[PDB]
Amino acid sequence: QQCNGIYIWKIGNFGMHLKCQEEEKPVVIHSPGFYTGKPGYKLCMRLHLQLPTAQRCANYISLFVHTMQGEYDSHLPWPFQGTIRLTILDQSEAPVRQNHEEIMDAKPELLAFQRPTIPRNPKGFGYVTFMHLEALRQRTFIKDDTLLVRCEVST
Amino acid sequence: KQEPQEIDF
Numbered sequence: 012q013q014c015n016g017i018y019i020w021k022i023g024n025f026g027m028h029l030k031c032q033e034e035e036k037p038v039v040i041h042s043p044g045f046y047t048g049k050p051g052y053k054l055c056m057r058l059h060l061q062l063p064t065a066q067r068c069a070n071y072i073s074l075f076v077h078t079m080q081g082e083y084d085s086h087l088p089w090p091f092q093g094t095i096r097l098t099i100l101d102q103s104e105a106p107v108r109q110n111h112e113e114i115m116d117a118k119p120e121l122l123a124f125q126r127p128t129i130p131r132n133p134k135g136f137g138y139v140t141f142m143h144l145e146a147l148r149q150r151t152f153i154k155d156d157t158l159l160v161r162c163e164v165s166t
Numbered sequence: 167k168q169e170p171q172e173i174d175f
Contacts, residue, residue: 057175075173115170123172134174 016047020056020160025153029144032060044079044131047164052091053081056162057135060144070144072099075137076162078123080130091117091124093166099142100159103151111142111152112161 020042022028032038038060044053059073074097081087098112115136117124123134147153 113168113170118172121172134172136172137170138168139171139173140168 014048015163015165016045016051017161017163018042018045018056020162022058022158022160024156025158026156028060032144033063035062035064037062041077042160042162044081045162046081046083047166050083050086051081052084052087052164052166053079054162054164055079055131056097056160057137058160061139068139071140072142072144073137073139074099074141074160075135076123077135078125078127078132080127084126089126090119091166092119093117093164095165096161096163097137097141098161098163099152100161101150101152102154102159109150110161111146113138113141 028038040058042056044055046053055077057075061068061071063070076095094116096114098110101108101110123136
């Protein structure tokens, strides 16, 4: 059997988030906290739609990962080590599917990978420029006004 | 290759 922890984050009412971003208002949403297994780490994803006017990163989807205090923390090694695959799923025809993803190795020297002293680690690890919003107009990433984000963790 | 980074929110 396989052993990686995988979470599928469904972000509904996406059109509403886009309108908000275009109105130059912050758009920050988090996935529910999820476990990489049992025992496993409790993590959550953070998605930001950068403002149309953000200079370093205008009109980008930012995607980060945060460690959280989990119920199995006493039975896990720390700091966290492993790889995390972040993917925005193509929901078009299966004939040929091109997901948009990045794979990142954890860096144990960063406090983002230690256990937080509060529910959610203030420090997160990820990509400010994960995917440009214009990319959503090139493939059916949005279906039934929903975006699908996948997170696979390999410890 | 795009490289991830740590951000303190």
